[PDB]
Amino acid sequence: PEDKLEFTFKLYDTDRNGILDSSEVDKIILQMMRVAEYLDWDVSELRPILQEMMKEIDYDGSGSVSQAEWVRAGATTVPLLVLLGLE
């Protein structure tokens, strides 16, 4: 999955600076919300959950998620591609 996670990172890094800052993470969260709603889940209190998940993925507390954090998380503890509806 590491090459899939790297491919997907590059799609959300719209300014191509190699990190996902807050507004780009926010886009990722909204896509995960749209996937959940599409499946007709109850999304009432899902968004605070997705935010805290992404806070944790920022391992070094930089306010941004680097490619290595994104890949490390998506390949070990969190099914990022499933949540985005990509897998």
Question: With binding defined as CB under 5 A, does residue 22 bind Ca ion?
Answer: no
Determine the residue with CB nearest Ca ion. Answer: 62
26 labelled binding-site residue: no
Work out how close the CB of 38 gets to Ca ion at its nearest, in angstroms, rounded to a whole number. Answer: 26
Strand partners for 7 = none
Residues 53 to 82 in contact with Ca ion, rule: CB under 5 A:
58, 60, 62, 66
* 6 labelled ligand-binding: no
Distance in angstroms (rounded) separating the CA atoms of residues 10 and 66: 11
Helix (H) or strand (E) holding 19: strand 19-20
